[PDB]
Amino acid sequence: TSQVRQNYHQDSEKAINRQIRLELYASYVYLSMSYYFDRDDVALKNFAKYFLHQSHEEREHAEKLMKLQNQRGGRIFLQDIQKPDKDDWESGLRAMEKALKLEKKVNQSLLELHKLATKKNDPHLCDFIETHYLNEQVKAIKELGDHVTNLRKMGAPRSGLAEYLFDKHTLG
């Protein structure tokens, strides 16, 4: 047992490892999206920049969990980061819709982790999740919803004009 460890259930430790993996997977999905928009036959540079930004943000989310794991005296165990579920993300709209689905899946995982921390009476872990993760997720989900809505109302994905103008005026 680590000399620092106090009130840290083994189930919470294991669950924090799994959340690290999910954050690293989200980072990889956004990286994939980014370079899809960088293709010569897609060529939406601000979609590309948006998703790259989100990729680097997810890596930071993973690093903060790795730091937490050590702070609490848990031990990090890593698994493979699986490839994202698509290679070609089809359109600006479809990518935003898949990102929305991703952020809601990551939110679900974090809500399950909070419920576990609550059952194990771990208020430090509860506060960590609330402070650094839950409102970050709500804001992300709201932002992505707003983007999806505007893309649909403008005529995407059938209007390539709509995606071009969105790239310029929202993501630019």
The two tokens of residue 58 are: 């997810």
Residues at the site binding Fe ion, with contacts judged by CB under 5 A: 23, 58, 61
Q: Is 10 in the site for a copy of itself (CB under 8 A)?
A: no
The residue among 11 and 43 lying less far from a copy of itself, judged by its C-beta, is 43
Q: Is 49 in the site for a copy of itself (CB under 8 A)?
A: no
- For residue 17, give Cα distances in angstroms to 68, 138, 152, 166: 10, 22, 37, 37
Q: Is 38 in the site for Mg ion (CB under 5 A)?
A: no
Of residues 129-148, which lie at the interface with a copy of itself (CB under 8 A)? 129-131, 134-135, 137-139, 141-142, 145-148
Annotated binding site for Fe cation: 23, 58, 61, 103, 137
In the block, tokens 């730091």 appear at: 67
Q: Is 143 in the site for Mg ion (CB under 5 A)?
A: no
Residue 48: CB atoms within 10 Å? 20
Residues 6+ apart with CB under 8 A from 137: 103, 106, 107, 110
